[PDB]
Symmetry: C6
Subunit: 62 residues, 6 copies
Protein backbone atom coordinates (compact mmCIF):
# COMPACT_ATOMS: atom_id res chain seq x y z
CA UNK A 1 0.00 0.00 0.00
CA UNK A 2 3.07 2.13 -0.54
CA UNK A 3 4.41 -0.48 -3.00
CA UNK A 4 1.49 -0.83 -5.43
CA UNK A 5 0.71 2.93 -5.76
CA UNK A 6 4.40 3.61 -6.31
CA UNK A 7 4.83 1.02 -9.08
CA UNK A 8 1.50 1.79 -10.76
CA UNK A 9 2.25 5.51 -11.00
CA UNK A 10 5.54 4.71 -12.72
CA UNK A 11 3.64 2.34 -15.03
CA UNK A 12 0.87 4.80 -16.02
CA UNK A 13 3.02 7.92 -16.38
CA UNK A 14 5.44 5.62 -18.26
CA UNK A 15 8.43 6.96 -16.31
CA UNK A 16 11.92 5.47 -16.88
CA UNK A 17 13.28 3.65 -13.81
CA UNK A 18 16.60 2.43 -12.59
CA UNK A 19 16.23 -0.93 -10.83
CA UNK A 20 19.27 -1.73 -8.68
CA UNK A 21 19.72 -5.38 -7.88
CA UNK A 22 21.17 -6.78 -4.64
CA UNK A 23 24.41 -7.57 -6.55
CA UNK A 24 24.75 -3.90 -7.59
CA UNK A 25 23.72 -4.36 -11.25
CA UNK A 26 21.63 -1.44 -12.57
CA UNK A 27 18.72 -2.22 -14.82
CA UNK A 28 17.08 0.53 -16.92
CA UNK A 29 13.71 0.50 -18.68
CA UNK A 30 10.03 0.93 -17.87
CA UNK A 31 7.63 -0.86 -15.58
CA UNK A 32 5.47 -2.60 -18.15
CA UNK A 33 3.59 -4.47 -15.42
CA UNK A 34 4.15 -6.23 -12.09
CA UNK A 35 2.54 -8.61 -9.63
CA UNK A 36 3.18 -9.73 -6.04
CA UNK A 37 6.58 -11.29 -6.84
CA UNK A 38 7.89 -9.95 -10.16
CA UNK A 39 8.26 -6.79 -12.18
CA UNK A 40 8.15 -6.79 -16.00
CA UNK A 41 10.79 -4.37 -17.20
CA UNK A 42 10.43 -3.16 -20.82
CA UNK A 43 13.33 -1.75 -22.78
CA UNK A 44 14.73 -3.59 -25.82
CA UNK A 45 12.89 -6.65 -24.42
CA UNK A 46 10.40 -7.43 -21.70
CA UNK A 47 12.40 -9.21 -18.99
CA UNK A 48 10.94 -10.58 -15.76
CA UNK A 49 12.71 -9.22 -12.66
CA UNK A 50 12.19 -11.03 -9.34
CA UNK A 51 11.45 -8.54 -6.54
CA UNK A 52 13.60 -10.61 -4.10
CA UNK A 53 16.60 -9.61 -6.24
CA UNK A 54 15.84 -5.88 -6.18
CA UNK A 55 17.34 -3.38 -3.65
CA UNK A 56 15.73 -0.19 -5.03
CA UNK A 57 13.44 1.19 -7.74
CA UNK A 58 14.60 4.74 -8.58
CA UNK A 59 12.41 7.10 -10.71
CA UNK A 60 14.44 9.19 -13.22
CA UNK A 61 11.98 12.06 -12.60
CA UNK A 62 10.17 12.69 -9.26
Amino acid sequence: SLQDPFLNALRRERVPVSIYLVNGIKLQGQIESFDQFVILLKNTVSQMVYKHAISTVVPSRP
Copy 2:
Protein backbone atom coordinates in the same frame (compact mmCIF):
# COMPACT_ATOMS: atom_id res chain seq x y z
CA UNK B 1 1.08 -13.74 -6.84
CA UNK B 2 1.09 -15.69 -10.11
CA UNK B 3 -0.86 -13.49 -12.54
CA UNK B 4 2.24 -12.12 -14.26
CA UNK B 5 4.78 -14.85 -13.48
CA UNK B 6 2.88 -17.90 -14.74
CA UNK B 7 1.76 -16.34 -18.11
CA UNK B 8 5.26 -15.02 -18.63
CA UNK B 9 6.96 -18.38 -18.00
CA UNK B 10 4.30 -20.54 -19.70
CA UNK B 11 4.60 -18.43 -22.91
CA UNK B 12 8.35 -19.04 -22.97
CA UNK B 13 7.74 -22.77 -22.28
CA UNK B 14 4.93 -23.37 -24.83
CA UNK B 15 6.81 -21.42 -27.55
CA UNK B 16 10.27 -22.85 -26.73
CA UNK B 17 12.02 -19.45 -26.59
CA UNK B 18 15.73 -19.50 -25.62
CA UNK B 19 16.13 -17.69 -22.32
CA UNK B 20 18.92 -16.11 -20.36
CA UNK B 21 18.33 -16.61 -16.63
CA UNK B 22 20.66 -14.38 -14.63
CA UNK B 23 21.33 -15.53 -11.06
CA UNK B 24 21.58 -13.24 -8.01
CA UNK B 25 25.38 -13.77 -8.16
CA UNK B 26 25.60 -12.59 -11.79
CA UNK B 27 25.97 -16.01 -13.47
CA UNK B 28 24.11 -16.22 -16.80
CA UNK B 29 22.33 -19.46 -17.54
CA UNK B 30 20.97 -20.29 -21.00
CA UNK B 31 18.54 -22.87 -22.27
CA UNK B 32 14.81 -23.32 -22.50
CA UNK B 33 12.10 -23.57 -19.88
CA UNK B 34 11.22 -27.27 -19.77
CA UNK B 35 8.76 -26.61 -16.94
CA UNK B 36 8.34 -24.80 -13.61
CA UNK B 37 6.37 -24.63 -10.37
CA UNK B 38 5.99 -22.16 -7.51
CA UNK B 39 9.61 -22.54 -6.40
CA UNK B 40 11.79 -23.91 -9.23
CA UNK B 41 12.35 -23.80 -12.97
CA UNK B 42 13.67 -26.65 -15.16
CA UNK B 43 16.26 -25.20 -17.55
CA UNK B 44 17.04 -27.60 -20.46
CA UNK B 45 20.26 -27.18 -22.37
CA UNK B 46 22.90 -29.94 -22.78
CA UNK B 47 21.48 -31.18 -19.48
CA UNK B 48 18.19 -30.39 -17.78
CA UNK B 49 18.96 -28.69 -14.39
CA UNK B 50 16.70 -27.43 -11.58
CA UNK B 51 16.92 -23.69 -10.80
CA UNK B 52 15.54 -22.22 -7.57
CA UNK B 53 13.66 -18.97 -8.20
CA UNK B 54 15.00 -17.50 -4.90
CA UNK B 55 18.36 -17.60 -6.71
CA UNK B 56 17.15 -15.92 -9.93
CA UNK B 57 17.34 -12.13 -10.47
CA UNK B 58 15.93 -11.97 -14.07
CA UNK B 59 14.51 -14.14 -16.85
CA UNK B 60 15.44 -12.54 -20.23
CA UNK B 61 13.88 -13.98 -23.43
CA UNK B 62 16.22 -13.91 -26.47
CA UNK B 63 13.48 -13.12 -29.07
CA UNK B 64 10.75 -10.50 -28.34
CA UNK B 65 8.25 -13.28 -27.34
Copy 3:
Protein backbone atom coordinates in the same frame (compact mmCIF):
# COMPACT_ATOMS: atom_id res chain seq x y z
CA UNK C 1 6.14 -4.62 17.14
CA UNK C 2 9.15 -2.32 17.12
CA UNK C 3 9.74 -1.69 13.42
CA UNK C 4 6.76 0.62 12.72
CA UNK C 5 7.19 2.85 15.82
CA UNK C 6 10.89 3.16 14.98
CA UNK C 7 10.52 4.15 11.31
CA UNK C 8 7.51 6.38 12.15
CA UNK C 9 9.60 8.51 14.53
CA UNK C 10 12.41 8.88 12.01
CA UNK C 11 9.61 9.96 9.65
CA UNK C 12 7.57 12.42 11.81
CA UNK C 13 10.74 14.05 13.05
CA UNK C 14 12.30 14.16 9.56
CA UNK C 15 15.62 12.75 10.75
CA UNK C 16 18.38 12.02 8.20
CA UNK C 17 18.98 8.26 8.02
CA UNK C 18 21.59 5.96 6.61
CA UNK C 19 20.09 2.81 5.13
CA UNK C 20 22.81 0.21 4.69
CA UNK C 21 21.99 -2.50 2.18
CA UNK C 22 22.97 -6.15 2.42
CA UNK C 23 25.71 -5.48 -0.17
CA UNK C 24 27.22 -2.58 1.82
CA UNK C 25 25.89 0.37 -0.18
CA UNK C 26 25.00 3.21 2.19
CA UNK C 27 21.96 5.28 1.28
CA UNK C 28 21.46 8.83 2.66
CA UNK C 29 18.00 10.38 2.83
CA UNK C 30 14.91 10.81 4.99
CA UNK C 31 12.05 8.35 5.47
CA UNK C 32 9.13 9.73 3.54
CA UNK C 33 6.99 6.65 3.99
CA UNK C 34 7.00 2.88 4.50
CA UNK C 35 4.80 -0.17 4.50
CA UNK C 36 5.30 -3.86 5.37
CA UNK C 37 7.87 -4.50 2.62
CA UNK C 38 9.29 -1.20 1.35
CA UNK C 39 10.63 2.12 2.50
CA UNK C 40 10.45 5.37 0.49
CA UNK C 41 13.78 7.18 0.90
CA UNK C 42 13.72 10.94 0.08
CA UNK C 43 16.78 12.76 -1.23
CA UNK C 44 17.24 14.09 -4.81
CA UNK C 45 14.31 11.75 -5.55
CA UNK C 46 11.78 9.57 -3.72
CA UNK C 47 13.11 6.02 -4.39
CA UNK C 48 11.61 2.76 -3.13
CA UNK C 49 13.95 0.51 -1.07
CA UNK C 50 12.91 -3.12 -0.46
CA UNK C 51 13.30 -4.09 3.23
CA UNK C 52 14.71 -7.56 2.32
CA UNK C 53 17.70 -5.72 0.82
CA UNK C 54 18.29 -3.60 3.93
CA UNK C 55 20.77 -4.66 6.63
CA UNK C 56 20.43 -1.58 8.94
CA UNK C 57 18.60 1.72 9.40
CA UNK C 58 20.99 4.06 11.27
CA UNK C 59 20.03 7.56 12.55
CA UNK C 60 22.65 10.25 11.73
CA UNK C 61 21.86 11.90 15.09
CA UNK C 62 20.18 10.30 18.17
CA UNK C 63 16.35 10.46 18.46
CA UNK C 64 15.77 13.25 21.05
Copy 4:
Protein backbone atom coordinates in the same frame (compact mmCIF):
# COMPACT_ATOMS: atom_id res chain seq x y z
CA UNK D 1 4.92 -29.82 -7.90
CA UNK D 2 8.13 -30.51 -9.81
CA UNK D 3 10.80 -30.29 -7.11
CA UNK D 4 10.05 -33.56 -5.27
CA UNK D 5 9.71 -35.78 -8.39
CA UNK D 6 12.96 -34.28 -9.70
CA UNK D 7 15.08 -34.82 -6.57
CA UNK D 8 13.46 -38.25 -5.98
CA UNK D 9 14.66 -39.53 -9.37
CA UNK D 10 18.18 -38.26 -8.82
CA UNK D 11 17.90 -40.13 -5.50
CA UNK D 12 16.37 -43.52 -6.56
CA UNK D 13 18.73 -43.72 -9.51
CA UNK D 14 21.75 -42.64 -7.43
CA UNK D 15 22.89 -40.07 -10.00
CA UNK D 16 25.91 -37.85 -9.23
CA UNK D 17 24.76 -34.23 -8.89
CA UNK D 18 26.36 -30.84 -8.78
CA UNK D 19 24.67 -28.52 -6.32
CA UNK D 20 25.70 -24.95 -7.03
CA UNK D 21 25.24 -22.57 -4.13
CA UNK D 22 24.19 -18.94 -4.35
CA UNK D 23 27.84 -17.95 -3.74
CA UNK D 24 29.16 -20.12 -6.60
CA UNK D 25 30.58 -23.05 -4.63
CA UNK D 26 29.95 -26.29 -6.52
CA UNK D 27 29.16 -29.34 -4.43
CA UNK D 28 29.65 -32.89 -5.80
CA UNK D 29 27.76 -35.83 -4.32
CA UNK D 30 24.57 -37.89 -4.55
CA UNK D 31 21.17 -37.05 -3.08
CA UNK D 32 20.70 -39.31 -0.11
CA UNK D 33 17.55 -37.60 1.08
CA UNK D 34 15.60 -34.33 1.17
CA UNK D 35 12.67 -32.61 2.76
CA UNK D 36 10.91 -29.24 2.27
CA UNK D 37 13.95 -27.16 3.29
CA UNK D 38 17.11 -29.26 3.14
CA UNK D 39 18.95 -31.76 1.01
CA UNK D 40 21.34 -34.44 2.34
CA UNK D 41 24.32 -34.62 -0.02
CA UNK D 42 26.39 -37.86 0.17
CA UNK D 43 30.09 -37.92 -0.61
CA UNK D 44 32.92 -38.40 1.95
CA UNK D 45 30.16 -37.53 4.45
CA UNK D 46 26.40 -36.98 4.57
CA UNK D 47 26.13 -33.16 4.91
CA UNK D 48 22.93 -31.12 5.11
CA UNK D 49 22.51 -28.37 2.45
CA UNK D 50 19.83 -25.70 3.00
CA UNK D 51 17.71 -25.18 -0.16
CA UNK D 52 17.67 -21.35 0.33
CA UNK D 53 21.44 -21.45 -0.27
CA UNK D 54 21.15 -23.49 -3.47
CA UNK D 55 21.03 -21.82 -6.90
CA UNK D 56 20.93 -25.01 -9.07
CA UNK D 57 20.83 -28.81 -8.94
CA UNK D 58 22.61 -30.07 -12.10
CA UNK D 59 22.80 -33.77 -13.14
CA UNK D 60 26.31 -34.88 -14.22
CA UNK D 61 24.70 -37.14 -16.83
CA UNK D 62 21.14 -36.90 -18.29
CA UNK D 63 18.29 -38.79 -16.52
CA UNK D 64 17.74 -41.87 -18.75
Copy 5:
Protein backbone atom coordinates in the same frame (compact mmCIF):
# COMPACT_ATOMS: atom_id res chain seq x y z
CA UNK E 1 9.97 -20.70 16.08
CA UNK E 2 10.84 -18.52 19.08
CA UNK E 3 11.71 -21.00 21.84
CA UNK E 4 15.47 -20.60 21.44
CA UNK E 5 15.67 -17.15 19.81
CA UNK E 6 13.61 -15.13 22.29
CA UNK E 7 15.29 -16.54 25.49
CA UNK E 8 18.68 -16.08 23.88
CA UNK E 9 18.07 -12.44 22.92
CA UNK E 10 16.10 -11.48 26.05
CA UNK E 11 18.96 -12.77 28.28
CA UNK E 12 21.42 -10.55 26.42
CA UNK E 13 18.95 -7.62 26.68
CA UNK E 14 18.02 -7.98 30.39
CA UNK E 15 21.69 -8.50 31.40
CA UNK E 16 23.11 -5.80 29.07
CA UNK E 17 25.81 -8.05 27.55
CA UNK E 18 27.94 -6.49 24.78
CA UNK E 19 27.28 -8.37 21.55
CA UNK E 20 28.95 -8.79 18.21
CA UNK E 21 26.32 -9.12 15.48
CA UNK E 22 27.93 -10.34 12.26
CA UNK E 23 26.00 -9.52 9.08
CA UNK E 24 25.58 -11.85 6.09
CA UNK E 25 28.16 -9.67 4.26
CA UNK E 26 30.77 -10.11 7.01
CA UNK E 27 30.41 -6.69 8.69
CA UNK E 28 30.74 -6.87 12.49
CA UNK E 29 28.42 -4.70 14.51
CA UNK E 30 28.91 -4.10 18.24
CA UNK E 31 26.69 -2.72 20.94
CA UNK E 32 23.92 -3.95 23.18
CA UNK E 33 20.46 -5.30 22.47
CA UNK E 34 18.13 -2.43 23.35
CA UNK E 35 15.13 -4.50 22.20
CA UNK E 36 13.87 -6.75 19.40
CA UNK E 37 10.80 -8.22 17.72
CA UNK E 38 10.11 -10.98 15.19
CA UNK E 39 11.96 -9.18 12.39
CA UNK E 40 14.42 -6.60 13.78
CA UNK E 41 16.86 -5.94 16.60
CA UNK E 42 17.71 -2.53 18.12
CA UNK E 43 21.49 -2.32 18.54
CA UNK E 44 22.53 0.55 20.88
CA UNK E 45 26.05 1.87 20.70
CA UNK E 46 26.95 5.55 20.02
CA UNK E 47 23.61 5.56 18.20
CA UNK E 48 20.69 3.16 18.41
CA UNK E 49 20.20 1.52 14.93
CA UNK E 50 17.64 -0.98 13.61
CA UNK E 51 19.05 -4.30 12.34
CA UNK E 52 17.00 -6.66 10.16
CA UNK E 53 17.42 -10.28 11.25
CA UNK E 54 17.29 -11.44 7.57
CA UNK E 55 20.63 -9.61 7.31
CA UNK E 56 22.21 -11.19 10.42
CA UNK E 57 24.32 -14.38 10.24
CA UNK E 58 25.29 -14.65 13.98
CA UNK E 59 24.79 -12.98 17.36
CA UNK E 60 27.97 -13.52 19.47
CA UNK E 61 27.90 -12.50 23.16
CA UNK E 62 31.24 -11.10 24.46
CA UNK E 63 31.00 -12.66 27.97
CA UNK E 64 29.82 -16.30 28.45
CA UNK E 65 26.24 -15.09 29.33
Copy 6:
Protein backbone atom coordinates in the same frame (compact mmCIF):
# COMPACT_ATOMS: atom_id res chain seq x y z
CA SER F 1 11.68 -34.28 9.05
CA LEU F 2 15.12 -34.72 7.57
CA GLN F 3 16.23 -31.47 9.27
CA ASP F 4 15.27 -32.13 12.90
CA PRO F 5 16.56 -35.76 13.08
CA PHE F 6 19.81 -34.65 11.48
CA LEU F 7 20.44 -31.78 13.92
CA ASN F 8 19.27 -33.71 16.99
CA ALA F 9 21.60 -36.64 16.28
CA LEU F 10 24.53 -34.23 16.08
CA ARG F 11 23.33 -32.66 19.35
CA ARG F 12 22.96 -35.93 21.30
CA GLU F 13 26.09 -37.68 20.03
CA ARG F 14 27.81 -34.31 20.64
CA VAL F 15 29.52 -34.43 17.23
CA PRO F 16 31.68 -31.48 16.06
CA VAL F 17 30.22 -29.69 13.02
CA SER F 18 31.41 -27.30 10.40
CA ILE F 19 28.71 -24.73 9.59
CA TYR F 20 29.40 -22.97 6.28
CA LEU F 21 27.67 -19.65 5.88
CA VAL F 22 26.37 -18.21 2.59
CA ASN F 23 29.37 -15.80 2.57
CA GLY F 24 31.79 -18.76 2.76
CA ILE F 25 32.80 -18.31 6.43
CA LYS F 26 33.30 -21.63 8.24
CA LEU F 27 32.06 -21.94 11.78
CA GLN F 28 33.21 -24.81 14.03
CA GLY F 29 31.70 -26.04 17.30
CA GLN F 30 28.82 -28.17 18.51
CA ILE F 31 25.08 -27.97 18.12
CA GLU F 32 24.11 -27.04 21.66
CA SER F 33 20.47 -26.61 20.63
CA PHE F 34 18.32 -25.26 17.80
CA ASP F 35 14.79 -24.20 16.93
CA GLN F 36 12.85 -23.42 13.74
CA PHE F 37 15.02 -20.42 12.81
CA VAL F 38 18.33 -20.56 14.71
CA ILE F 39 21.08 -22.91 15.76
CA LEU F 40 23.03 -22.44 19.01
CA LEU F 41 26.65 -23.23 18.28
CA LYS F 42 28.85 -23.97 21.33
CA ASN F 43 32.62 -23.65 21.23
CA THR F 44 34.42 -20.99 23.28
CA VAL F 45 30.98 -19.29 23.51
CA SER F 46 27.39 -20.08 22.67
CA GLN F 47 26.60 -17.99 19.59
CA MET F 48 23.23 -17.87 17.85
CA VAL F 49 23.46 -18.71 14.13
CA TYR F 50 20.51 -17.81 11.89
CA LYS F 51 19.59 -20.72 9.59
CA HIS F 52 18.92 -18.27 6.70
CA ALA F 53 22.67 -17.52 6.76
CA ILE F 54 23.75 -21.17 6.59
CA SER F 55 24.60 -23.06 3.33
CA THR F 56 25.59 -26.41 4.91
CA VAL F 57 26.00 -28.28 8.20
CA VAL F 58 28.86 -30.78 7.80
CA PRO F 59 29.47 -33.55 10.41
CA SER F 60 33.20 -34.15 11.15
CA ARG F 61 32.38 -37.87 11.54
CA PRO F 62 29.58 -39.70 9.62
